């Protein structure tokens, strides 16, 4: 367990908890390129179980993710619904490799 | 402007307004034809926004207005709905040409 140590000493009884962001600051974010990742899952709205509505694959332009474009009509109201759904999760596997740059940290 | 004058003289400071509905009489109507206009519009429920519902044109040839015929069934009841919608407006574009005949007006 001590092979994974990242700090010289343990959290003592009543050490002070220094706060770094003492002033509002727009952040400069830096990381190592693999420390952050997006995880996507398909939404199977094209399955035969969803027969009523019309489902097409939807492309998100730049991020390289795929969603679904669904439309369904109601006859009692003569109104239709359009849904674009995208399923993903942003994960930080290496938070220790991600950093934030906070300038003007006074008062 | 004077080319459109339809009345001998304007309304004075105080001239009595003569009521002409003095008895409840069923109306007789006369007009010059095409004084009434029927404005009709389509209902685009055949658009892709309406996917679970089956929509087709519906002609009512007795008058000359095309309506919409739509059907949509649900699986939980194994029942379907049928809607026949007609969108129109009745407009009296020449009210001076429409006339009303009122018999037995004495009060």
From Swiss-Prot, chains A, B:
Gene Ontology CC annotations of this record: T=7 icosahedral viral capsid; viral capsid; viral procapsid
GO biological process: viral procapsid maturation
Disulfide bond entries: none
Keywords assigned by UniProt, alphabetized: Capsid protein, Late protein, T=7 icosahedral capsid protein, Virion
UniProt superkingdom: Viruses
GO MF annotation: an example: identical protein binding
Principal cellular location given in the protein's record: virion
Keyword presence, Iron: no
Functional note: Self-assembles to form an icosahedral capsid with a T=7 symmetry.
Domain statement: The insertion domain (I domain) plays an important role in the folding of the capsid protein by acting as an intramolecular chaperone.
Family: Belongs to the P22 phage major capsid protein family.
Protein name: Major capsid protein
Biological source species: Salmonella phage P22
Residues represented out of the complete protein: 324 to 430 of 430
């Amino acid at each position: 367990q001590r092979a994974y140590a990242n700090v010289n000493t343990s959290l003592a009884d009543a050490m002070a908890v220094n706060i770094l962001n003492v002033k509002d600051a727009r952040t400069n974010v830096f990381w190592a390129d693999d420390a952050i990742r997006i995880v996507s899952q398909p939404i199977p709205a094209n399955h035969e179980l969803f027969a009523g509505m019309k489902t097409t694959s939807f492309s998100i332009p730049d991020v390289g993710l795929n969603g679904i474009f669904a439309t369904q009509g109601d006859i009692s109201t003569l109104s239709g619904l359009c849904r674009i759904a995208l399923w993903y999760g942003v994960n930080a596997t290496r938070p220790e490799a991600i950093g934030v740059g906070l300038p003007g940290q006074t008062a």
